[PDB]
Write an enzyme that holds these catalytic residues in place. Structure first.
Site, PDB file in Angstrom:
ATOM      1  CE1 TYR B  26       1.201  -0.399   4.325  1.00  0.00           C
ATOM      2  CE2 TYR B  26       0.308   1.818   4.317  1.00  0.00           C
ATOM      3  CZ  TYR B  26       1.076   0.841   4.912  1.00  0.00           C
ATOM      4  OH  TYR B  26       1.721   1.104   6.098  1.00  0.00           O
ATOM      5  CG  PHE B  36       1.236  10.009   5.260  1.00  0.00           C
ATOM      6  CD1 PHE B  36       0.730   8.858   5.830  1.00  0.00           C
ATOM      7  CD2 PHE B  36       0.349  10.912   4.708  1.00  0.00           C
ATOM      8  CE1 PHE B  36      -0.632   8.618   5.858  1.00  0.00           C
ATOM      9  CE2 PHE B  36      -1.008  10.671   4.731  1.00  0.00           C
ATOM     10  CZ  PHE B  36      -1.498   9.524   5.306  1.00  0.00           C
ATOM     11  CG  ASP B  37       1.627   5.228   5.964  1.00  0.00           C
ATOM     12  OD1 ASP B  37       2.272   4.720   6.901  1.00  0.00           O
ATOM     13  OD2 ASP B  37       0.657   5.984   6.143  1.00  0.00           O
ATOM     14  CB  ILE B  56      -8.209   2.979  10.747  1.00  0.00           C
ATOM     15  CG1 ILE B  56      -7.464   2.827   9.420  1.00  0.00           C
ATOM     16  CG2 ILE B  56      -7.386   3.791  11.734  1.00  0.00           C
ATOM     17  CD1 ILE B  56      -7.138   4.144   8.749  1.00  0.00           C
ATOM     18  CE1 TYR B  82      -4.674   5.873  13.185  1.00  0.00           C
ATOM     19  CE2 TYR B  82      -4.337   6.813  11.012  1.00  0.00           C
ATOM     20  CZ  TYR B  82      -4.156   5.784  11.912  1.00  0.00           C
ATOM     21  OH  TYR B  82      -3.453   4.664  11.535  1.00  0.00           O
ATOM     22  CG  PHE B  99      -3.944   4.540   2.541  1.00  0.00           C
ATOM     23  CD1 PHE B  99      -4.303   5.785   3.027  1.00  0.00           C
ATOM     24  CD2 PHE B  99      -2.958   3.828   3.201  1.00  0.00           C
ATOM     25  CE1 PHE B  99      -3.684   6.312   4.144  1.00  0.00           C
ATOM     26  CE2 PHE B  99      -2.335   4.350   4.317  1.00  0.00           C
ATOM     27  CZ  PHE B  99      -2.699   5.593   4.789  1.00  0.00           C
TER      28      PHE B  99
END
Lengths: 318, 107, 801, 373
Positions: B26, B36-37, B56, B82, B99
């Site tokens: 992912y 950021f990922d 999540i 979040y 994502f």
């Protein structure tokens, strides 16, 4: 109680402690002189480039310069340095070999002269590089606090000054007169003031504690070795009838403040005399002096003997 | 809610139910395209269960919606993310996450 | 960025440092902290360790193995890492772990990079990586050193590193080594850091070999001793020789016995020692091998020679301008010469444990690691909670009270002391209480722990304060625990410390407590609650094992009379009232709840608890009966001074005045106010102790008077309270304890005096009723009942039938 | 009034007194027993005197005359030379029978824990009236004089500012005398040169000696209170937003040097507080004072340097740094540009003396990293 009933690990720990205390500790190894000689060897520093002498100072010279830098660094207080203590011990042991000699048969005065030359050469190896100034900067930075640092400094200074040689006496005097500082004598006065004497109250406490089955020289007149080292250092400074030092100790010319080391010595001697008088008054009634009291008397009288010798040195020269 | 858009065809007819392990590759970024990922830089697929709620809820629903061997872009709102909590130094306290997920090697 | 060959030097160094900081620094620091001590388990792997490598080549001896290449058995806790993931739901909380990175790949990458850097340095070029040789070499050396100290590298990796450092000396039975090439100062510093690791590995190998030899030798010694004991016990013929041998080798403490066994180094001592020739020769051979390994006996052949030659050659080649580099080279050089001294100073930290306790030892090390790590962090709520949990785990661990020597060697007491000092320098009262209770438990463990804690007694006194003392657990209580019930330590106490505590006692008596005046309680001009702590510490200091330390008592009383401000408002000067006035004022201020309130403080109880504690301290400071009988002038003077300070009439009156007694009301049980602005029999017990020490009981008439007025009402109250509902009350047990601890033993001691009563018959009979009913009372300790019983018989022995 | 003090006041510069014989020629040559003379306070410039209200006072030179300020040196309370050291003497006021002595020990003073021994002039006196003399270094002698002159000049400057403060100048200049702006700037440059860090090229020993000299000079000035005076001047000038406003209230000829004076004041403050931990610790209550001025366009570099010097030296202020403070600091990067000095300030905030401030690290992280700008 028997060993064969004990667990293996506890017996192993006991064996480790006993072996360390008996075999390893009692072993003797001599490396100070060899290491000092290896460090004093200059190598190729005088041959690879012939422009400036000591362009790359001897490793011992660099070591003593580093210690002098740490001395001269402005700090709130001095801190413990195991490296400095070990190196000071090594240097003192290296330069004290001839002083210690490392009934009797006849020894020629020429042989005494030859061992004297050995001692002078060993002292030259150290004082031709900055040790005479390092032992003064250490004392100045100690700020009148007793510890292993000042003890090692005093021992190294005594080892350097053995024989009372005018070379290091003059070097120390020149350094003091050039810097015109008061911290050195202030620290000396503080260290003299914080000296110990006989304490019969602590002696009684020790006697009762030892008798009840719960002995230590710490109870009465500890730091006697430090006191003897201090007065031996002063005596070696005044050795040889050097009127310059004999007058500089009395009056600090040039400095904004002066300290009377002579009066400090007299005051300490008076305190020691009062302590010995108190011990006499306590032990007067007893018919037989206890062995512990004999030991305390011996230590006190040894310290008193050292004090007098220092005083005589101060005035032996008219 | 979570929006799912296909990118490449998948195997199909293989949707992980509750109780299996799944490995995914992912890449997740902010609404403004701030990455950021990325599981590819770590060179390891992310392993996760379904029903344990370790991930999540939006990610779990998105992963369970698609099939095996399928690449899908999932838009997760802060409600199922979040949101206000976010992550100190990572995610702002109000952001919508995007994502891209390639589900493979279902077990 | 690690392998980018065109990156600028500053950015290269920054990226290397960033990687090290965010992926290795914490684990490296924890391992470095744990590396100080050597706790080797007793395992076959441990015993397989030998000092020198075996002669694999054939007929080879005294050949050092490659440093850092061997078997390490000392316990080091493993590292912990967590995978960096940001998709998991985000929920005191457990401490987070360092991000994870593939270490097996990272170490190979670093090793290959270092090899390439060395080759590029050997092949001279005008475009070094990073812009300079320093920028090329320093980051790689830093990373390699970090990995090496963390222990990631294997045996083959260490061999390759040794080949890179020097191909000649470190070869295993052309290329330019890292030592031969000219390098700047930073590279030299990094290489010194590299060599320190191998020196430490050599030291650890030596200590582990020594431990293994100790394990091998202890069993043989035990077997030989058992055989000799079997021979000796059977030796009934030579009875005198058997007794002498038994007294010599057996019937002795194990430490002295093993010292006698090992004291055979000299030829003369060999005859005295009963050890066999082979057993002695084993130790002799091992000692010779140890000296050979330490080096106590021109291409270099060993690490010591290599390091010494390199340092000397460097110092000869250039005048080093870096103080850090100079310190590094000289500190490294000193160890090579003084290798034996390094082992001598490292042995104290060595320890041997059983293989069955390794798991709990590892748990203890893991718990201690967090406490050590939290020193460098400023104290906060989460850190305080983590230390609370860690201390709790430390207490619950069984190794804590089974290896006090190991605990002392690790020195966690100093660690928790520094934590307490940092938090004191009040905030975090829970942390302060936990530290104080841990220190108290550590003192209670063993006497050597108490002696170790005694060395900081004076410093805790300086740290102590009025609020700190009023905390539930305080450094004052730590000092009390470190000095309690130790006659030698009490004798070794210092008049300067006693003067400091007396100064604090005087100071707390001149102003009100800030906490109470902030909460709104009225100002009284002194702190009885403040004085309680100092009075308790003073009575612990003076009284040990049921006897009074004469020196401490004399010093304390002299300081107390020199500074009368410690006596409180009353009993001081012209304005000081008596005990009667003080306690009556306390009773009235207790009867007035408004004055007692601004209630939890109970200042009314504080007022007379202060005087009760003072009376107890004076009684414990009172001299001894044997000294009084012998007529020691100082003891008589001290007793006279205490007599002048405290009158007898005050003691009698305050004993006489009564206390509140719970009854049963309409609801079936009335109020029972105790410890809350109410009179307690413990105060009267302290006064009775004072009356026993000074103002002794010698007159029959005075004894019966002070009994009938002062003790009989309490006995009758206890008799009334003996009933089940009344005995269920909490203060009935307090009255029973007070009686059995203060009143009844006095009656036992004065029983011979009771002989020959004049017109005392009916009161003596009534007190016999009271004593017998108390003896047959219910809900009391067996010891208390026995006390009443023996008092009954002892009194009856001297009464006319 | 004069008292008895203790501690570091021995090294302090307020204990200095200067002697002046009533003659002119050869005044500094020799001093005679019983010779009338005047005693002056080096730091404040006031002469010891007698008054009908109090025994010992200090008065200005205008009120200083022979009937009150004339003192002499006697011994042993005798109505009918003098060693600088190793001697004692008694002091009588000229043309009066009173002798210098202190008041009877005050129990209240002891209660207050004050060593003060208010000296009152009586004929009866006491037996502790003998006193010891000891001179001081030319460094301190010079520094006290500079302190006195600087205090006078800066007080005149502050009074001049307050004269037109509150009433705009408009057309006509303020009725008060023109402020000595040239004297102020010259004195500021002199003080900046006087407080200068030692050069790193110097040898270690001489550099350490210069560091000690600079530290003690800074200590003397801060204990005499020049730092508070500088801060008061900075507040007085920051009352006005711009040179145009300062001209509208003081005139263009006076406002031409406004920015230069402000920059010189900030530089002098930075020099005074740089490297002295005790001086930096005095700013613990002035964090708002040094933070709220970071947004001012003039002397931004100076105020940033002042903040940096405080932060890299005081570990106490880092326990007072708050979220709004950190946001204000980050606003410098947001509004002024990409300056690495702000990053250095943040790094100083993070960790101090090997101790990590978790709150500061978390606040910096949360207020800087998430934006990705």
């Amino acid at each position: 109680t028997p060993l064969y009933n004990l667990p293996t690990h506890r017996a192993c720990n006991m064996f480790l402690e006993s072996y360390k205390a008996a075999w390893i500790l009692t072993e003797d190894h001599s490396f100070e002189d060899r290491m000092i000689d290896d460090l004093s060897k200059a190598g190729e520093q005088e041959e690879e480039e012939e422009e400036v002498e000591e362009k790359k100072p001897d490793p011992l010279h660099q070591l003593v310069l580093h210690f002098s830098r740490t001395a001269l660094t402005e700090k709130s207080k001095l801190d413990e340095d195991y490296l400095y203590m070990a190196y000071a011990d090594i240097m003192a042991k290296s330069c004290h070999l001839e002083e210690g000699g490392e009934e009797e048969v006849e020894v020629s005065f020429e042989e005494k002269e030859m061992e004297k030359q050995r001692l002078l050469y060993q002292q030259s190896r150290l004082h031709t590089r900055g040790a005479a100034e390092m032992v003064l900067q250490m004392i100045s930075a100690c700020k009148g606090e007793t510890g292993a640092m000042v003890s090692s400094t005093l021992k190294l200074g005594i080892s350097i000054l053995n024989g009372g040689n005018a070379e290091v006496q003059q070097k120390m005097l020149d350094y003091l007169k050039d810097k015109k500082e008061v911290g050195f004598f202030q620290s000396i006065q503080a260290l003299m003031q914080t000296c110990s004497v006989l304490d019969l109250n602590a002696f009684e406490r020790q006697n009762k504690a030892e008798g009840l089955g719960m002995q230590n020289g710490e109870k009465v007149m500890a730091d006697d070795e430090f006191t003897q080292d201090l007065f031996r250092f002063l005596q070696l400074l005044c050795e040889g009838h050097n009127n310059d030092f004999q007058n500089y100790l009395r009056t600090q010319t040039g400095n904004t403040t002066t300290i009377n080391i002579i009066i400090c010595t007299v005051d300490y001697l008076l305190r020691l005399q009062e302590s010995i008088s108190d011990f006499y008054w306590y032990y007067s009634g007893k018919d037989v002096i206890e062995e512990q009291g004999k030991r305390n008397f011996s230590k006190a009288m040894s310290v008193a003997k050292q004090v007098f010798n220092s005083l005589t040195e101060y005035i032996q020269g008219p | 809610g979570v929006e799912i858009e296909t990118i490449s065809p998948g195997d199909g007819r293989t949707f992980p139910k509750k109780g299996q392990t799944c490995v995914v590759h992912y890449t997740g970024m902010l609404q403004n395209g701030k990455k950021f990922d990325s599981s590819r830089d770590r060179n390891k697929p992310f392993k996760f269960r379904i029903g344990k709620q370790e991930v999540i809820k939006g990610f779990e629903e998105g992963a369970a919606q698609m099939s095996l061997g399928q690449r899908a872009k999932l838009t997760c709102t802060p409600d199922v993310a979040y949101g206000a909590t976010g992550h100190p130094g990572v995610i702002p306290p109000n952001a919508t996450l995007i994502f891209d997920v390639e589900l493979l090697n279902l077990e | 960025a690690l392998e980018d060959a065109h990156l600028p030097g500053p950015l290269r160094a920054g990226y290397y440092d960033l990687l090290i900081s965010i992926h290795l620094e914490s684990a490296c620091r924890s391992r470095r902290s744990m590396l100080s001590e050597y706790i080797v388990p007793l395992t076959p792997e441990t015993r397989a360790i030998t000092l020198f490598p075996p002669g694999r080549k054939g007929g080879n001896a005294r050949r050092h193995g490659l440093p850092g290449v061997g078997v390490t058995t000392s316990l080091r806790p493993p590292h912990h890492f967590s995978p960096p993931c940001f998709v998991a739901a985000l929920p005191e909380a457990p401490a987070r772990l360092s991000p994870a990175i593939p270490l097996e790949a990272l170490r190979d990458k670093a090793l290959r990079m270092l090899g390439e850097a060395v080759r590029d340095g050997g092949q001279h070029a005008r475009d070094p990586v990073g812009g300079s040789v320093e920028f090329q070499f320093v980051p790689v050396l830093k990373l390699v050193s970090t990995l090496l100290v963390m222990g990631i590298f294997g045996d083959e990796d260490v061999k390759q590193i040794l080949k890179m450092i020097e191909p000649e000396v470190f070869t295993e039975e052309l290329e330019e080594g890292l030592l031969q090439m000219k390098l700047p100062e930073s590279v030299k510093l990094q290489m010194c850091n590299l060599l320190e690791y191998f020196c430490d590995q050599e030291l650890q190998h030596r200590v582990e070999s020594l431990a293994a030899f100790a394990e091998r030798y202890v069993d043989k010694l035990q077997a030989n001793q058992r055989s000799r004991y079997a021979l000796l016990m059977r030796a009934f013929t030579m009875s005198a020789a058997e007794t002498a041998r038994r007294t010599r080798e057996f019937r002795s403490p194990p430490q002295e016995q093993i010292n006698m066994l090992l004291h055979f180094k000299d030829e003369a001592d060999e005859e005295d020692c009963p050890l066999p020739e082979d057993i002695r020769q084993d130790l002799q051979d091992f000692h010779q091998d140890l000296l050979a390994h330490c080096g106590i006996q021109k291409k270099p052949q060993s690490l010591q020679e290599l390091v010494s030659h390199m340092v000397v050659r460097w110092a000869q080649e250039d005048y080093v301008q870096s103080p850090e580099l100079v310190r590094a080279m000289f500190s490294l050089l000193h160890r090579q010469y003084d290798g034996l001294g390094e082992l001598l100073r490292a042995l104290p930290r060595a320890y041997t444990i059983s293989p069955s306790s390794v798991e709990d030892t590892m748990s203890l090390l893991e718990c201690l690691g967090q406490i050590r790590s939290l020193l460098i962090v400023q104290m906060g709520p989460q850190e305080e909670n983590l230390m609370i949990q860690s201390i709790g785990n430390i207490m619950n661990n069984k190794v804590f009270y089974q290896h006090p020597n190991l605990m002392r060697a690790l020195g966690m007491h100093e660690t928790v002391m520094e934590v307490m000092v940092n938090v004191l320098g009040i905030r975090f009262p829970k942390m302060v209480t936990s530290c104080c209770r841990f220190l108290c438990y550590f003192c209670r463990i063993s006497r050597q722990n108490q002696r170790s804690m005694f060395d900081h007694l004076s410093y805790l006194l300086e740290n102590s304060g009025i609020g700190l003392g009023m905390q539930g657990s305080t450094p004052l209580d730590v000092a009390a625990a470190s000095v309690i019930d130790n006659n030698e330590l009490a004798l070794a106490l210092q008049e300067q410390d006693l003067e400091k505590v007396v100064s604090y006692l005087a100071g707390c008596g001149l102003q009100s407590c800030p906490m109470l005046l902030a909460k709104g309680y009225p100002d009284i001009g002194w702190n009885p609650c403040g004085g309680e702590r100092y009075l308790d510490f003073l009575r612990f200091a003076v009284f040990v094992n049921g006897e009074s330390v004469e020196e401490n008592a004399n010093v304390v009383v002299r300081l107390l009379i020199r500074k009368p401000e410690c006596f409180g408002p009353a009993l001081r000067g012209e304005g000081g009232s008596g005990l009667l006035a003080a306690i009556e004022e306390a009773i009235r201020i207790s009867e007035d709840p408004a004055r007692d309130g601004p209630n939890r403080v109970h200042l009314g109880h504080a007022i007379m608890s202060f005087y009760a504690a003072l009376i107890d301290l004076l009684g414990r400071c009172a001299p001894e009966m044997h000294l009084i009988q012998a007529g020691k002038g100082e003891a008589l003077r001290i007793r006279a001074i205490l007599r002048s300070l405290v009158p007898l009439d005050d003691l009698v009156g305050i004993i006489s005045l009564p206390l509140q007694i719970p009854t049963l009301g309409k609801d079936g049980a009335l109020v029972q106010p105790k410890m809350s602005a109410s009179f307690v029999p413990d105060h009267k017990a302290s006064m009775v102790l004072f009356l026993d020490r000074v103002y002794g009981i010698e007159n029959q008439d005075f004894l019966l008077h002070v009994l009938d007025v002062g003790f009989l009402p309490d006995m009758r109250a206890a008799a009334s309270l003996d009933t089940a509902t009344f005995s269920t009350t909490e203060m009935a047990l307090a009255l029973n304890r007070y009686l059995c601890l203060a009143v009844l033993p006095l009656i036992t001691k004065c029983a011979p005096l009771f002989a020959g009563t004049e017109h005392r018959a009916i009161m003596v009979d009534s007190m016999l009723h009271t004593v017998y009913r108390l003896s047959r009372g219910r809900s009391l300790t067996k010891a208390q009942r026995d006390v009443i019983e023996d008092c009954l018989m002892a009194l009856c022995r001297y009464i006319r039938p | 009034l004069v008292y008895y003090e203790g501690g570091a006041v021995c090294t302090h510069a307020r204990s200095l007194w200067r002697l002046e014989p009533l003659r002119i020629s050869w005044s500094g040559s020799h001093l005679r027993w019983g010779q009338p003379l005047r005693i002056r306070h080096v730091t404040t410039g006031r002469y010891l005197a007698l008054t009908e209200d109090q025994g010992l006072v200090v008065v200005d030179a205008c009120k200083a005359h022979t009937k009150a300020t004339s003192f002499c040196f006697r011994v042993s309370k005798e109505k009918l030379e003098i060693k600088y050291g190793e001697s004692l003497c008694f002091v009588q006021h000229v043309a009066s029978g009173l002798w210098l002595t202190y008041a009877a020990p005050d129990p209240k003073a002891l209660r207050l824990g004050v060593l003060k021994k208010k000296a009152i002039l009586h004929q009866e006196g006491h037996m502790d009236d003998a006193l010891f003399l000891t001179r001081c270094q030319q460094e301190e002698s010079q520094a006290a004089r500079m302190i006195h002159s600087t205090a006078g000049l800066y007080n005149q400057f502050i009074k001049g500012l307050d004269s037109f403060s509150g009433k705009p100048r408009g057309s006509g200049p303020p009725a008060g005398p023109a402020l000595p702006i040239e004297a102020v700037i010259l004195s500021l440059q002199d003080l900046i040169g006087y407080f200068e860090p030692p050069s790193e090229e110097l040898q270690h020993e001489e550099k350490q000696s210069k560091l000690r000299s600079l530290r003690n000079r800074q200590s003397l000035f801060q204990e005499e209170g020049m730092l508070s005076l500088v801060l008061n001047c900075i507040d007085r000038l920051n009352v006005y937003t711009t040179a145009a406003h300062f001209a509208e209230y003081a005139g263009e000829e006076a406002a031409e040097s406004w920015k230069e004076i402000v920059n010189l004041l900030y530089e002098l403050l930075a020099s005074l507080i740089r490297g002295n931990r005790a001086n930096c610790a005095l700013f613990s209550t002035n964090l708002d004072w040094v933070v709220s001025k970071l947004d001012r366009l003039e002397a931004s570099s100076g105020i940033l340097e002042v903040l940096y010097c405080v932060l890299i030296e005081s570990p106490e202020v880092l326990n007072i740094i708050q979220e709004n403070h950190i946001k204000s600091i980050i606003s410098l990067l947001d509004k002024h540009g990409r300056n690495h000095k702000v990053l250095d300030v943040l790094c100083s905030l993070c960790v101090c003396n090997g101790v990590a401030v978790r709150s500061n690290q978390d606040l910096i992280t949360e207020n800087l990293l998430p934006g990705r700008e």
